[PDB]
Structures are given as structure tokens and as C-alpha cells.
Design an enzyme around this catalytic site. Structure first.
Site, PDB file in Angstrom:
ATOM      1  N   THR A 126      68.821 -74.451  81.596  1.00  0.00           N
ATOM      2  CA  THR A 126      68.363 -74.116  80.849  1.00  0.00           C
ATOM      3  C   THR A 126      69.119 -74.761  79.753  1.00  0.00           C
ATOM      4  O   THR A 126      70.165 -75.127  80.506  1.00  0.00           O
ATOM      5  CB  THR A 126      68.170 -72.529  80.202  1.00  0.00           C
ATOM      6  OG1 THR A 126      67.723 -71.864  80.257  1.00  0.00           O
ATOM      7  CG2 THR A 126      69.435 -72.743  78.336  1.00  0.00           C
ATOM      8  N   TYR A 133      67.009 -60.345  81.950  1.00  0.00           N
ATOM      9  CA  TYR A 133      66.016 -60.843  81.095  1.00  0.00           C
ATOM     10  C   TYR A 133      65.038 -59.687  81.069  1.00  0.00           C
ATOM     11  O   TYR A 133      65.247 -58.618  82.186  1.00  0.00           O
ATOM     12  CB  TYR A 133      65.588 -62.180  80.830  1.00  0.00           C
ATOM     13  CG  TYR A 133      66.373 -63.830  80.670  1.00  0.00           C
ATOM     14  CD1 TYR A 133      67.100 -63.020  79.435  1.00  0.00           C
ATOM     15  CD2 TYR A 133      67.025 -63.515  81.970  1.00  0.00           C
ATOM     16  CE1 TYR A 133      68.245 -64.094  78.818  1.00  0.00           C
ATOM     17  CE2 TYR A 133      67.540 -64.895  81.393  1.00  0.00           C
ATOM     18  CZ  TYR A 133      68.896 -64.700  80.315  1.00  0.00           C
ATOM     19  OH  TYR A 133      69.510 -65.775  79.449  1.00  0.00           O
ATOM     20  N   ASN A 186      74.092 -59.927  81.648  1.00  0.00           N
ATOM     21  CA  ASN A 186      73.836 -59.052  80.702  1.00  0.00           C
ATOM     22  C   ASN A 186      72.900 -57.719  80.730  1.00  0.00           C
ATOM     23  O   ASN A 186      72.038 -57.119  80.466  1.00  0.00           O
ATOM     24  CB  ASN A 186      72.350 -59.781  79.490  1.00  0.00           C
ATOM     25  CG  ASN A 186      73.199 -60.836  78.770  1.00  0.00           C
ATOM     26  OD1 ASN A 186      74.247 -60.582  78.744  1.00  0.00           O
ATOM     27  ND2 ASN A 186      73.055 -62.022  78.978  1.00  0.00           N
ATOM     28  N   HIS A 212      60.646 -65.475  85.852  1.00  0.00           N
ATOM     29  CA  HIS A 212      61.760 -65.451  85.426  1.00  0.00           C
ATOM     30  C   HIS A 212      62.068 -63.047  86.372  1.00  0.00           C
ATOM     31  O   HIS A 212      62.002 -62.843  84.667  1.00  0.00           O
ATOM     32  CB  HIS A 212      62.594 -65.914  84.651  1.00  0.00           C
ATOM     33  CG  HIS A 212      64.294 -65.651  85.005  1.00  0.00           C
ATOM     34  ND1 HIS A 212      64.728 -64.875  85.096  1.00  0.00           N
ATOM     35  CD2 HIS A 212      64.905 -66.365  83.705  1.00  0.00           C
ATOM     36  CE1 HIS A 212      65.850 -65.005  85.551  1.00  0.00           C
ATOM     37  NE2 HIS A 212      66.204 -65.889  83.842  1.00  0.00           N
ATOM     38  N   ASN A 240      68.441 -62.203  85.450  1.00  0.00           N
ATOM     39  CA  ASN A 240      69.113 -62.327  85.481  1.00  0.00           C
ATOM     40  C   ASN A 240      69.742 -61.429  83.928  1.00  0.00           C
ATOM     41  O   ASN A 240      69.759 -62.035  82.935  1.00  0.00           O
ATOM     42  CB  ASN A 240      69.655 -63.437  84.925  1.00  0.00           C
ATOM     43  CG  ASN A 240      69.363 -64.118  86.070  1.00  0.00           C
ATOM     44  OD1 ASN A 240      70.224 -64.106  86.957  1.00  0.00           O
ATOM     45  ND2 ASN A 240      69.709 -66.070  85.639  1.00  0.00           N
TER      46      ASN A 240
HETATM   47  C1  LIG Z   1      73.592 -74.340  82.481  1.00  0.00           C
HETATM   48  C2  LIG Z   1      73.059 -73.366  83.150  1.00  0.00           C
HETATM   49  C3  LIG Z   1      71.866 -73.026  82.262  1.00  0.00           C
HETATM   50  C4  LIG Z   1      70.949 -72.294  83.108  1.00  0.00           C
HETATM   51  N1  LIG Z   1      69.423 -71.532  83.107  1.00  0.00           N
HETATM   52  C5  LIG Z   1      68.990 -70.666  83.779  1.00  0.00           C
HETATM   53  C6  LIG Z   1      67.924 -70.498  83.657  1.00  0.00           C
HETATM   54  O1  LIG Z   1      66.837 -71.115  82.542  1.00  0.00           O
HETATM   55  N2  LIG Z   1      67.140 -69.652  84.521  1.00  0.00           N
HETATM   56  C7  LIG Z   1      67.884 -69.249  85.567  1.00  0.00           C
HETATM   57  O2  LIG Z   1      67.065 -67.937  86.365  1.00  0.00           O
HETATM   58  N3  LIG Z   1      68.852 -69.636  85.892  1.00  0.00           N
HETATM   59  C8  LIG Z   1      69.516 -70.210  85.116  1.00  0.00           C
HETATM   60  N4  LIG Z   1      70.652 -70.829  85.286  1.00  0.00           N
HETATM   61  C9  LIG Z   1      71.597 -69.937  86.679  1.00  0.00           C
HETATM   62  C10 LIG Z   1      71.090 -71.224  87.975  1.00  0.00           C
HETATM   63  O3  LIG Z   1      69.765 -70.914  88.053  1.00  0.00           O
HETATM   64  C11 LIG Z   1      71.920 -71.079  88.992  1.00  0.00           C
HETATM   65  O4  LIG Z   1      72.135 -69.795  89.733  1.00  0.00           O
HETATM   66  C12 LIG Z   1      73.395 -71.006  88.601  1.00  0.00           C
HETATM   67  O5  LIG Z   1      74.280 -72.019  88.655  1.00  0.00           O
HETATM   68  C13 LIG Z   1      74.410 -70.925  90.454  1.00  0.00           C
HETATM   69  O6  LIG Z   1      73.890 -71.704  91.305  1.00  0.00           O
HETATM   70  P1  LIG Z   1      75.035 -73.550  91.084  1.00  0.00           P
HETATM   71  O7  LIG Z   1      76.119 -72.637  92.062  1.00  0.00           O
HETATM   72  O8  LIG Z   1      74.174 -73.656  91.915  1.00  0.00           O
HETATM   73  O9  LIG Z   1      75.205 -73.719  89.527  1.00  0.00           O
HETATM   74  C14 LIG Z   1      71.740 -71.550  84.763  1.00  0.00           C
HETATM   75  C15 LIG Z   1      73.008 -72.002  84.622  1.00  0.00           C
HETATM   76  C16 LIG Z   1      73.616 -73.109  84.499  1.00  0.00           C
HETATM   77  C17 LIG Z   1      74.966 -72.979  84.494  1.00  0.00           C
HETATM   78  O1  LIG Z   2      73.195 -70.236  80.649  1.00  0.00           O
HETATM   79  N1  LIG Z   2      72.344 -69.988  80.779  1.00  0.00           N
HETATM   80  O2  LIG Z   2      71.527 -71.169  79.618  1.00  0.00           O
HETATM   81  C1  LIG Z   2      71.603 -69.392  81.406  1.00  0.00           C
HETATM   82  C2  LIG Z   2      70.196 -69.269  81.021  1.00  0.00           C
HETATM   83  C3  LIG Z   2      68.923 -68.381  81.712  1.00  0.00           C
HETATM   84  N2  LIG Z   2      67.966 -67.969  81.232  1.00  0.00           N
HETATM   85  O3  LIG Z   2      66.886 -67.822  81.922  1.00  0.00           O
HETATM   86  O4  LIG Z   2      67.318 -68.776  80.527  1.00  0.00           O
HETATM   87  C4  LIG Z   2      69.693 -67.199  82.972  1.00  0.00           C
HETATM   88  O5  LIG Z   2      68.633 -67.166  83.814  1.00  0.00           O
HETATM   89  C5  LIG Z   2      71.304 -67.871  82.801  1.00  0.00           C
HETATM   90  N3  LIG Z   2      71.650 -67.276  84.650  1.00  0.00           N
HETATM   91  O6  LIG Z   2      71.245 -66.055  84.408  1.00  0.00           O
HETATM   92  O7  LIG Z   2      72.731 -67.880  85.032  1.00  0.00           O
HETATM   93  C6  LIG Z   2      71.896 -68.757  82.770  1.00  0.00           C
END
Ligand SMILES: Cc1cc2nc3c(=O)[nH]c(=O)nc-3n(C[C@H](O)[C@H](O)[C@H](O)COP(=O)(O)O)c2cc1C
Ligand SMILES: O=[N+]([O-])c1cc([N+](=O)[O-])c(O)c([N+](=O)[O-])c1
Ligand SMILES: O=[N+]([O-])c1cc([N+](=O)[O-])c(O)c([N+](=O)[O-])c1
Length: 348
Positions: free
Chosen positions: A28, A180, A235, A175, A178
Site C-alpha cells: 500500500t 482485514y 489489528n 487479501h 493481516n
Molecule cells: C509500506 C507497506 C505497505 C504494505 N501494504 C500491504 C498491502 O497492501 N497488503 C498486504 O497484504 N501487505 C502489505 N504490507 C506487508 C508486506 O506485504 C510484507 O508482508 C511486509 O512488508 C514484510 O515483508 P518485508 O520484510 O520483505 O518488507 C505492507 C508493508 C509495508 C511496509
Molecule cells: O502498512 N500498510 O499500509 C499496510 C497495508 C495493508 N493492506 O492490506 O492495506 C496491509 O495488509 C499491511 N500489513 O499487514 O503489513 C500493511
């Protein structure tokens, strides 16, 4: 240490073979336009990451009451579809593949974004506080959905999936992770229902499977993946009974022969007593098909984990923010730029 196996080709199924084992994790960025349509900046951002075997897009909302954060893209309007088509064309022209991550925030939605309506969830279990970077937007008590509401949600997930194919994506990651909406049905903390969607593992798994099955019916199992979080961390509070929910869900998921199941966890070194260890090792021990690992791995530790048969593909998040050329750098033994939160301000 070796990273050679990260560059194996990986056949997901008859429809899709990935050119390597590295996925861009869903991230995101909150940079869609006011109509939640992807922008040219987003097109360029994804396009320059097409060296990945597969990109998972940022979470993308299925309809208006799914929104909980500003400027998160959707894929329920024709304008949004057209914006995403620009993204997918660019990724494909750059030699890549991309799935959308389909999202509903459930109790984490906020009515500010959709004109004051009901926040929907399995149960009226409010979360504390306010929307990040918008403290005025205090979270509200959700309405516990009716079965008719649930069927509407299932329909809208499926319609969104149809729109995803229209926009030229290779597939959908649901999704279910996390904290949701789908994850809210799968944990006792958030799901206090006493009807056919609560109580027992079959009932608590019902919504996830209905969504999976509705999407498969429209776009096919080869193009459908699912992210899950058996370990509660984001959450979501855990409950030891959540173990038996996932013990049931996983074999049911395996029957659907999905493109993949993807772990939702941030630091995969964390263990959950009720799961008997890490989230990924729990799933691997109870699920026999393609698994995507994630959560504070480097290329080196991911490669080792894959050599140890711990999972099959690696999703990379934060390093892909800092390195559009992550894959090329890992392939060619080049050093990587360190991630810093300040980098979230720009879409490069
Ligand atoms: C800025 C940011 C945005 C993320 N947005 C999502 C998201 O939109 N959907 C999701 O399932 N996880 C999201 N995550 C979790 C990542 O998909 C991932 O699981 C997490 O960053 C851990 O992996 P990494 O150590 O390689 O960063 C987000 C993480 C970060 C840091
Ligand atoms: O940080 N974030 O914006 C973020 C957003 C989402 N999401 O689905 O919109 C996640 O699942 C997670 N997440 O769980 O890591 C993080
Ligand atoms: O994945 N994530 O994007 C993510 C983001 C945050 N955060 O700072 O809001 C977390 O606290 C965690 N976390 O602690 O698991 C994960």
C-alpha cells in the site's frame, strides 16, 4: 551464501509459469488519485519492477465501503479499470506478470471515505483509535453483517475479480490476511458470531471459502491466490481456538488447487504457540501446495529457506521499495540500497 535457486523458473500451473521465484509483496502506497484510479506514477513504479517473477499489487478495494485509508486504489469503476489497464500493459511490456490484491478492510474501514455508511464486519467488535495520518477519523463500531450482506460481499469480490481480468491482470491474490475482512471471520477475537459463519472451524472458514469459490467460478483457480495470517499480529488478537479454524481451512483450500497461498506476516522469525511455531512453518506442515514466504527475509535467508523446503516462492516488500531493480541486483551480485521509511514519500 547462494541465491541461485531464486532464479529457477517456477510453474504455478498449466496457465502460469513464473520466470523466477521472487515476488514483489503487496505494498500500500496511498497514491491513487481522488477517484481511486491508478496514476501514471503508479504505472511507472510497477513497470520498473517487472523483473520479478510476479508482482502482487498494493491492496485494492472491491467497493466503496471497503475503504479505510486515503487514496488506496479500487477496481469497481470503469475509470479504475482503465487506469489499471495502463499498469498491466506496462508491466507486460516490461516482461513481467502482475496479480491484483483484492481488499475489503471490514472493521478497519472508515465512513469518512464512503459518505457515512455502515462499517461492516463479522461482529460488532470495534478497533481502538483513528485512521493513520487522519486522527479526526475515529474508528466506529461495525455492524455485524447479515447473511444477505455476506452474499453481497461475496458477489462484489467476484465482480472485482472479473474487473481484474478485464484490466489485463494475470490473476488475483485475495487479501485474507493481516486483520482485514476475511481474516476477521477466521479469528475468534473478531468473530463472535453464533450463526452459520461463527463458532466451529467449518463455519468460521465459510466466508473465506465462499469468496475463494466465487472468484474461481469467474476467473479460474490457476489465476487465484490467497494471503492468510494464521498468526494474529496486525489489528488482531490471537485465541488458541484459532488453531483448529486454520487446521480445517487449509485442507479445504488445498482442494481448490489455488495458484498459491501466501503468508501474511512481518517478521517470520516470530512464533505462535497455538500454531506450534512460525506462521510459515505451521502452514507448510499442514498444506501441500505452492507456498509464498515473506517477512524480514533477505535473498540469502529466503534462498536457504527454499532449499530447506520451508516454502516455494519469496515475496519481498521493503527492499523492493528501496530497489526497483531488486531482482537484477540480487541476480548480478550487486549490493542493495537499505530501506528507510522516508522513501514512502516518493513513488519510485
Ligand atoms: C509500506 C507497506 C505497505 C504494505 N501494504 C500491504 C498491502 O497492501 N497488503 C498486504 O497484504 N501487505 C502489505 N504490507 C506487508 C508486506 O506485504 C510484507 O508482508 C511486509 O512488508 C514484510 O515483508 P518485508 O520484510 O520483505 O518488507 C505492507 C508493508 C509495508 C511496509
Ligand atoms: O502498512 N500498510 O499500509 C499496510 C497495508 C495493508 N493492506 O492490506 O492495506 C496491509 O495488509 C499491511 N500489513 O499487514 O503489513 C500493511
Ligand atoms: O507489515 N507492515 O506494513 C507493518 C507495518 C507496521 N506499522 O509500523 O504500522 C507494523 O507495526 C507492522 N508490524 O508490527 O507487524 C507491520
Amino acid at each position: 551464501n547462494s541465491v541461485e535457486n531464486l532464479f529457477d523458473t517456477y510453474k504455478l500451473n498449466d496457465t502460469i509459469t513464473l520466470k523466477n521465484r521472487i515476488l514483489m509483496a503487496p505494498l500500500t502506497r496511498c497514491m491513487a488519485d481522488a477517484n481511486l484510479v491508478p496514476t501514471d506514477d503508479m504505472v511507472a513504479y510497477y513497470a520498473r519492477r517487472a523483473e520479478a517473477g510476479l508482482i502482487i499489487s498494493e491492496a485494492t478495494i472491491i467497493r466503496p465501503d471497503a475503504q479505510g485509508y486515503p487514496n488506496t486504489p479500487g477496481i469497481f469503476t470503469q475509470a479504475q479499470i482503465a487506469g489499471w489497464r495502463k499498469v498491466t500493459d506496462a508491466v507486460h511490456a516490461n516482461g513481467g506478470k502482475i496479480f491484483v490484491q483484492l481488499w475489503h478492510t471490514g472493521r478497519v474501514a472508515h465512513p469518512h471515505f464512503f459518505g457515512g455508511g455502515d462499517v461492516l464486519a463479522p461482529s460488532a467488535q470495534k478497533i481502538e483509535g483513528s485512521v493513520p495520518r487522519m486522527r479526526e477519523l475515529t474508528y466506529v463500531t461495525p455492524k455485524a453483517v447479515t447473511v444477505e450482506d455476506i452474499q453481497g460481499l461475496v458477489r462484489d469480490y467476484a465482480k472485482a475479480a472479473e474487473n481484474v481480468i478485464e484490466a489485463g491482470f494475470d490473476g488475483v491474490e485475495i487479501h485474507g490476511a493481516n486483520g482485514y475482512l476475511i481474516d476477521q471471520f477466521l479469528h475468534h477475537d473478531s468473530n463472535r458470531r453464533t450463526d452459520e459463519y461463527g463458532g466451529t472451524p467449518v463455519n468460521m472458514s465459510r466466508f473465506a471459502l465462499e469468496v475463494v469459490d466465487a472468484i474461481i467460478a469467474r476467473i479460474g483457480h490457476d489465476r487465484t491466490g490467497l494471503r492468510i495470517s494464521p498468526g494474529a499480529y496486525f489489528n488482531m488478537a490471537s485465541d488458541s481456538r484459532d488453531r483448529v479454524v486454520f487446521d480445517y481451512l487449509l485442507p479445504e483450500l488445498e482442494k481448490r488447487d489455488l495458484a498459491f497461498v501466501h503468508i501474511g506476516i512481518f517478521d517470520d522469525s516470530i512464533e505462535f504457540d497455538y500454531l506450534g511455531g512460525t506462521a510459515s512453518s505451521y502452514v507448510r506442515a499442514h498444506y501441500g501446495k505452492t507456498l509464498v514466504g515473506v517477512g524480514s527475509y533477505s535473498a540469502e535467508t529466503a534462498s536457504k529457506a527454499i532449499a530447506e523446503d520451508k516454502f516455494d516462492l519469496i515475496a519481498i516488500g521493503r527492499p523492493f521499495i528501496a530497489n526497483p531493480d531488486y531482482v537484477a541486483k540480487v541476480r548480478n551480485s550487486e549490493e542493495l540500497v537499505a530501506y528507510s521509511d522516508e522513501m514512502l514519500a516518493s513513488l519510485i
